[model samples]
Target: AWDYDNNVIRGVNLGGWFVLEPYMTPSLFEPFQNGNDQSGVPVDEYHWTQTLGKEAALRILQKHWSTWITEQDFKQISNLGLNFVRIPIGYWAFQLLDNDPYVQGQVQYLEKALGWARKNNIRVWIDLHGAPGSQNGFDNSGLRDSYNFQNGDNTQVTLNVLNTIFKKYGGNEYSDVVIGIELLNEPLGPVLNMDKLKQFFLDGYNSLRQTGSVTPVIIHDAFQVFGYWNNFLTVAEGQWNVVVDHHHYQVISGGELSRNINDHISVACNWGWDAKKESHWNVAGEWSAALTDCAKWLNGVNRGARYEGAYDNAPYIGSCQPLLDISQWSDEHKTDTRRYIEAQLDAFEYTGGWVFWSWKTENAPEWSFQTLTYNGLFPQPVTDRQFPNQCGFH
Candidate 1:
């Protein structure tokens, strides 16, 4: 896998900024409940561009594109002891035709980070955050159209997009500053068949290696963990590093958030043991400690519902329990949020290391790295962390 003095990939993601999420950055959109969604529901990238006339959209995003993150931000992150940056970029990165629909300036914007990180001594983990056919149907995927790349020619188009990326910039040219690339962001997991996904990985690997790419390559676990995938592609005959990108999140499901602070402390710390047992290069590509499922202004709907199952077919559901809101936890219980955040970090250490879900958010303190750091929710940069054993099978 990846090793350093700390042996931990302690970092944060530049989300909501590159990928437009009105909820995460309401001020960037309609400063109201659920923000713009590009105009209507099923908010994905296409809808976003469609809502704003092509040219008008480009103008507004142009300003944010230059400012959301800058050269100074890299210096700031370096000082924070963060060595990696997991940036989410969309397919629009490669589609630069006359009527490309997406702003023509996005890819250029993404490249700027590469230059900044190279100068700042940070490894850039470029996550292919959006796919041509919405990978997971999440607004974050840049489109909410049911995932289309999994089967059909769309997958081929997606593969081409990926190869283009590897072909353009691959290798440790900038002092190994560009660490690796994730194939797809979050492809809907429950219904996916690995055979197809694995095929895509195999194709991507061949493409990257053929072009003399030197950076490690990673693929998301699709919500499943401790997968035996690394064994399938260790390339006992080739020179390449393939990692499993696993995202760890709490508060998304009822079963996950039903626990108390102590319960979460133990859960977060133990979940990665499954990966240790399997033995491979795996990373918690994304994780956060918000503890609440609802976003933006909605304080309590589906507050902590892990599973929507109703009891007795008629019940109050214990008045519907909710996960602790990390942003406001300091006011409710003196040290609970501290324990939660620390426990999450400690838990991620077991998976080898992690990149927190986001670098910043509009008003969501718990989810924003800047807010968390300023509030003192996270401890000083941890060094000397260990990579688990029962290890590195790949």
Candidate 2:
């Protein structure tokens, strides 16, 4: 029932719910902050689980999983005029093998979420946020700098997890709500072999189809969006529906963080223009309203913001401490933020779709779509933007 070309997927990511992101929920990682980043402390879920041990990790994760996002959130998302919710779950939710430190209580919560999605009549995009090995050496993955997924049996294990997920939710029972399954999230494209990744993708697709579910298979561009996968899969050749997902974030580079808010808008428009040149069904699967990388522990646990020159010793732009709260924003700040949101919506609307990086956060207003919407920062109907046609193509 989902048509990529005709219907724009107005969605928000349920980030930091199943997968832990210290930036979104700092309280989980606060106690461990004092420890050394390279050693004793736990900066990511993998380390956190190992440090807490199985017994305590299970107890703590159970509490966090149950309380973080609930059925109420799903109902509210429906009320907010959102059609899709992309939930990121690590591979540990389905399969944890051979000394993997992630706790295993998230799958039950994941099941409960599907029921809630059914109740709200909203589609769900299940994203495998973390692989056996950290996909991008980023904290969002279960382990940071553990970019050895391609080594040993990790890739095969990842495929097994995919099969497990499909068998559980791939049939007509969940077909109404579970829109698609992303093969993997943000694999380090530059560091990985394309032939190897491509083979894994092909094999993953076959495994999904084996379940007899024609649900669209989503694939990340591995940070190489423009020309990497232009001719990878041919839908006309009887391949099951597949989509290319490209994440757009402005804070990843020092230059990006230094650019004026207006430049951010232009870059968003440029993505739209370039996407038009590609042949695949592409979506800005992950993006954010935040212009600066000022969110706490956003880079990593105990990591500083690039905006303040605290990250990688980049040139300092300004103090990041003041930018955390939306309530303290100036009138000019509010205008620019609103314009930036509108620009992304307009630009990604021209592509297949767009899903904001996160739906909620503990304190980071810029990263929380729900917070932005409640504060009248995000447009209510989402389509009722003050700056309609904000981008040239739109």
Candidate 3:
């Protein structure tokens, strides 16, 4: 067991591109004018794609493992005064061979990332991005279907993998930088059964303790918990160093270009921690700025325009927003959103920290937002506005 006393964790999520590779259907690429991959299907049905098969999934992991983290990226993050990074590791990143389960080269890549963070005095939080059968149906886990938690065997396998990860990096001095392990991202489907979901969390928590790894454990509310904050507060109790994670997205009905910032802060304070003496809370992931017009797109319009734009721009709109749009907010909106977010951060005294939906912006110039390489070093010029001065939220 490692100690986590003074760690004020703050960081960003490295998502979409890496774990969701299998789901990058034709629609996702169309915006770049690269034309759709005739073989790719709709985003909702990506799980049925052969590319998500175990073999193809493993290959994707291997490729990402080799190049996801670099020394330069670490230096940039450290310079930014960031103390932590939440790494979402997909289920396929670890596999069993001859009945012995082991993490693939991605583990090494993680270790390398840790080494880089260590050099810069940063910490890490290992998050299980995609759980067994996928906690959610989204392509982030390379799955196209709803999560099925009723499968006893699959749940056991997930528990086993969780234990394996703890065992591999739980107590090493180098692993101290790893402050916590996020049990799941956003659980969906039958797994949404609150009783079973709670059990799963308790089971994983107890299982890790059994191995003598007492590092802090983090759990996210079910997707249903977003609108049902009361239920989350009622059940979010009974664990040490436990943190509750909530995800928020903007409202689409008003034709407004901004988020429902006040609503999010209200939920965080009222349900997440205010009334609950036993629970602590923080935002595990925030709005996907790319989903809005807050970021630049190859077509230079809000990615959400796909639902309302003229037929002429449909081909240029792509199936989804460019990866860059999904990660960082536009330079113009950064200040407003930052102020709004900082206000919430202040209102909820119990709030631990927040992680943006992604780290590096995308690099598909024709389709990307900021021209930064995914998982690569963030350019100095691009990050100027991220600081308190430009954002006006210090």
| Candidate 3 CA-lDDT value | 0.51
C-alpha lDDT values of all predictions: 0.68, 0.86, 0.51
RMSD of each: 5.1, 1.7, 7.2
Cα displacement (Å) at residue 253, model 3: 7.4
Candidate 1: tens digits of C-alpha lDDT, residues 127-244: 8888876778777877654667675667888888888788766754543667788888887777677778778888988888888776778878777656656466775856357778
Off by over 4 Å in 1: 1-6, 31-42, 96-100, 172-175, 235-239, 297-334, 382-394
lDDT (Cα, tens digit) per residue for candidate 2, span 1-394: 6888788888989999888888888888777655545334578888898989999999998899999999999999899888888989999988888887777878888889999988887888899989887768999988887788898888999999999888887878888888789999999989988789999999988888887988889999998858678778776666758888989988888989888877888998888899878887888889988888899888887678888998898899988877788888888878888999998888888888889978889999999998899888899888878877767683
The residue pairs that clash in candidate 1, if any, are 44-142, 44-143, 45-142, 45-143, 253-306, 254-305, 254-306
Better of 1 and 3 by lDDT: 1
Q: Could you tell which candidate, 1 or 3, scores higher by TM-score?
A: 1
Clashes of each: 7, 0, 6
Q: Score every model by TM-score.
A: 0.84, 0.96, 0.67
lDDT of 1: 0.68
User: Which pairs of residues collide in candidate 2?
Assistant: none
Q: What lDDT does candidate 2 reach at residue 216?
A: 87
Error of 3 at 27 (Å): 12
Instruction: Estimate, for each residue in 163-261, the C-alpha lDDT of model 3 and write its tens digit.
Output: 877787666664557777888877763446778777888888777777777676777766554334333423345446566666654423233322354
